[PDB]
Ligand binder design. Structure first.
Ligand SMILES: [Ca+2]
Ligand SMILES: [Ca+2]
Ligand SMILES: [Ca+2]
Ligand SMILES: [Ca+2]
Ligand SMILES: [Ca+2]
Ligand SMILES: [Ca+2]
Ligand SMILES: [Ca+2]
Ligand SMILES: [Ca+2]
Lengths: 236, 236
């Protein structure tokens, strides 16, 4: 690579157990520059080296910081195509840093419109076969999440914050989430609400059956650190 | 334009009453060349002229052919149809051919990922205000349809054929459709199943509560004609 970078970490909370489920790793510059400032440097001649560097940096920092729950890693959209040769680097990093593979979750975001779902399906089912956890990252925004779910199911579906925002007072968003939550339960998929910013949102989601949540209400990302979570969701 | 073209029409069937709800207008070459063959010729400098031409030809043919139900027109992805309010050419065409605005439905497909929903929402609500019927064309494929429905609702949501293909055999697709149909009712949106190809699909969808359907099982598009619907579906 021509550049270097590091990671921030944002906690995912289990509101039913009031414990931390894990942390999502998010790229930052060496002086806490934005993720977009780093990702904008990636190109077709870069993507595979960068993707491997994100995974190894995330595992190594998580190890150094003493992470004992889940580590969630964003998978650079257009996949490594052949999940065989390229998965080696991740399995070796996990072994070398003694980070259990079943405590690593990969979050999947589509690059382009998914005409043939088999490719991304193949990668998700291969990762599951190795013991990784898997998630759909952007349900309710960007590309069609139902197009994905119709042909394969991840362990977790992360619901975009756009569907979450002000849900305690938005009847249309309440209907969407009530019916999507029933869908996820029918498919044996665990939902995770992203972008929770207020107690009012959290309380509605909790009453609606959501356990896993993420967002500034709980904690912002911590540069090269594991942020502690707002005690207010454990109180209230 | 440096090319010419015409329209085919494909019926939308109300499976409860067995009446034709309307027809979707689909671009064709003058010698029945494919829609892709025509649309491939559309570029940045002629998109607006091409869109207006599609509308006038569809209205003129539907009138010439004696259409008395709904005419459904595909709205060319509007990331460049930013300005809008060039709709007098549509209104004038309808009046010339004595075709009510209320019997014209526009089907909306996104041009790219919808980060700011206000642009596409602005167009749909303006068309509703003029009296047009509106539909989300590609729910369950392409770009996120839930992203749209969270912020505005059309009269109809068309469900992509990928979600209904062999739905009588596919428990995952069954759960997706059962929960989406409940969502559509909560939003007061009428569902329409696209791409029905077999009696088994039709019968499952009819039992699930879908009334409006479209697909080869009923009738293929008809070049400059209003096709008749399959007698087998009427009885069976
Ligand atoms: Ca994402
Ligand atoms: Ca993510
Ligand atoms: Ca996400
Ligand atoms: Ca998506
Ligand atoms: Ca379309
Ligand atoms: Ca259409
Ligand atoms: Ca469609
Ligand atoms: Ca779509």
């Amino acid at each position: 690579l021509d550049f270097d970078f590091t990671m921030a970490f944002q906690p995912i909370v289990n509101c039913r157990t009031k414990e931390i489920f894990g942390y999502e790793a998010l790229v930052r510059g060496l002086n806490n520059e934005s993720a977009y400032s780093v990702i904008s440097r990636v190109n077709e001649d870069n993507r595979y080296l960068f993707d491997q560097m994100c995974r190894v940096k995330a595992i190594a920092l998580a190890a150094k910081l003493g992470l004992t729950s889940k580590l969630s890693i964003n998978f650079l959209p257009n996949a490594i195509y052949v999940p065989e040769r390229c998965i080696r680097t991740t399995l070796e990093a996990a072994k070398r840093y003694q980070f259990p593979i079943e405590n690593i979750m990969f979050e999947f975001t589509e690059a382009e419109r998914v005409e043939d779902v088999n490719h991304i399906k193949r990668i998700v089912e291969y990762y599951k076969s190795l013991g990784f956890q898997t998630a759909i990252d952007d349900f309710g925004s960007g590309y069609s999440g139902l197009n994905l779910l119709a042909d394969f199911q991840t362990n977790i579906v992360k619901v975009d914050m756009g569907l979450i925002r002000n849900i305690h007072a938005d009847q249309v968003r309440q209907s969407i989430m009530k019916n999507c939550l029933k869908l996820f339960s029918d498919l044996n998929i665990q939902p995770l609400a992203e972008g929770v910013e207020s107690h009012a949102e959290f309380a509605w989601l909790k009453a609606a059956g959501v356990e896993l949540m993420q967002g500034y209400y709980f904690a912002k990302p911590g540069f090269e650190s594991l942020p502690s979570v707002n005690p207010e969701f454990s109180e209230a």
